Amino acid sequence: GDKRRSGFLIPNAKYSTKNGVEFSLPYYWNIAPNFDATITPHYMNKRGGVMWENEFRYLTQLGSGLTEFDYLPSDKVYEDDHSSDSNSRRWLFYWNHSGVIDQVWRLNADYTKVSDPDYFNDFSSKYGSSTDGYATQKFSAGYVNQNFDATVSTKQFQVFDRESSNSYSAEPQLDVNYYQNDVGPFDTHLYGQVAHFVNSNNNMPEATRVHFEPTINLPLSNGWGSLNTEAKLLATHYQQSNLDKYNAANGTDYKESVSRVMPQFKVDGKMVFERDLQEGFTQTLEPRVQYLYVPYRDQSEIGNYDSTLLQSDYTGLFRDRTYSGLDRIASANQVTTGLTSRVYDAAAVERFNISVGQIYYFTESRTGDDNINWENNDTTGSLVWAGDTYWRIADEWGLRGGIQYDTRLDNVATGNGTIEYRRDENRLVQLNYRYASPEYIQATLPSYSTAAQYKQGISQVGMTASWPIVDRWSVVGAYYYDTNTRKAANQMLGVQYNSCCYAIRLGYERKVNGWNSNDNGGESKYDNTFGINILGTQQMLRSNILPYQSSL
Amino acid sequence: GWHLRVPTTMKTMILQSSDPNGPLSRAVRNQLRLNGVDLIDASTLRKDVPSLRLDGSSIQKDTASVFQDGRTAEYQMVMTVHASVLIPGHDIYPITTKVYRSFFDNPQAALAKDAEQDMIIQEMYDKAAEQLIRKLPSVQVADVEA
Ligand SMILES: CCCCCCCCOCCOCCOCCOCCO
């Protein structure tokens, strides 16, 4: 049917290596003022058909939402690569929803499902690209009000790998929180969780975890200092099942019923020293010390469901958790010390910031299952260092950076730096650089440090630029470069011109798409694409596999 | 020696938003409560008490770096927070702040990574809150005789 609408939209064309010539003819349908739809025939050449891209949007009292369904009945290239089954249809379904009813009820949905793991590698869209390694499928409904909140959710993930697609899922997960601030001088905080973990692989064990965590916190502060103490309990119980086969395959001692209760003592002191400088400028120096103690518990009988190693930002040094989730809580006997230095102008605007921190270990942080293959066996001392910085010379330029170092790796673990020149939306240039050492990948990602795609880590520079050459024309481009392999990862060049009312926009992008086995070791697959689209907005900056983000 | 260090005008303040129980609202309320700022509802007559309006917030998760195979190595989330201090009689003053964080991805432990993504976001909501309160001194000095 489709009427009472706006009409056909102006089509757009594309030429890519995997799809050939492409012709998209959108057709918009304004069903109502608060919900509408859009049907887009998207003809592809060497795919041998028209992919129907369907979009729908709605605005209700229960929340705002969007739904997408792309469908291709048959794919010729995919049929050549995968000729086992005669069925060759390929599709995508997406559903986003978010709503806060009566300022208390919270309804949220972020669902993405695809027909095959090689969908987003071939078909690019707003809801996925070649860089995605898995699709997320989250649902959540909760009740939140000031002193109390309780949310129930279901989390699933579709991993894009035909050989190893093992991933856990919480079905369901309940999170409850109580608060009360003026319990004498103490601020109290109760947290409880009840989760049921299942895996797509039936050989993997299932579990039902119950967690109870009361936290009492005494904060004191005056004019110059702030001393905050905290006592926290961690009671956890595991009802595990389906363990015989997994205990046969791997050398593990997982049992069906496992209990674990851990105390936690944390103290955090902070100071501040102001210092006046020239021309009305005012800098400040804040030191911060924190002691942390958590006893050791043998957690070798407990599985792993949502626990992974965290990264230490400067503020992350003062975090009381090494892993995520609640399956692997490491022992603690640590003394974190840090120092920050800020500056301000005559108008008290924060212009420049430096942060340097370290942590000292009295005893080693054990979990009962510490198989993190470090480069050396340094257990105690000033192991982890971190630092951040930010510089704003004026209203236009900008700078920001951060580096995390670890002595157990004998090299800097993480390191990113970015400088930017930002006039407005149309005029800007940005230079960035990100770095992760092979030791870091070896320690945190054991499986990726073996293959040649992720072994050497990251050393990637990047240059984004939006600049108009002629007063009415406009040009934009991006260029990312790998330092280790001396090769480019993503390149982009595009021009745009607003002639009168509707602008014309030509673009070109080349990107790393896959990894080519069967070679003299291995190489990376590259994809080229040109595009023509025919209000005044620059989506070309955020159209790459590494989108542009303003660092001020 | 060198002198030791929220203004007195903002010791009593109003906190208003369309989502009062949201993460950003509770983070700002908690943080300013740590500084000793007293909170009162708008039901008071309230002519001398300043206001702290939370306009909105959004998170943008983009790919920061990529591996040799064309897959995401680490994401970079950027939390943009829009607020505005309302001094009755002296016009409104808008405030903006950004929080940049990043973390490595791993599809083999996707659920775990989700638990990390929830842990970082929360932290960001707190960090942003701090960056909103440290800019109040710059808003107080903006009140000059013109
Ligand atoms: C298969 C899904 C079909 C379910 C859709 C039924 C939704 C009915 O409830 C919607 C109630 O909200 C009414 C929307 O009101 C207009 C939105 O703007 C109102 C401003 O508050």
Ligand SMILES: CCCCCCCCOCCOCCOCCOCCO
């Ligand atoms: C020495 C470290 C031991 C760890 C501390 C254990 C503390 C045990 O007592 C917990 C009691 O806390 C009660 C919960 O607080 C109230 C929260 O609920 C208030 C409802 O709004």
Ligand SMILES: CCCCCCCCOCCOCCOCCOCCO
């Ligand atoms: C509020 C303390 C701030 C001072 C900073 C340094 C604190 C270092 O002292 C820690 C004392 O604990 C020593 C740990 O002893 C070894 C573990 O065995 C004792 C447990 O029974």
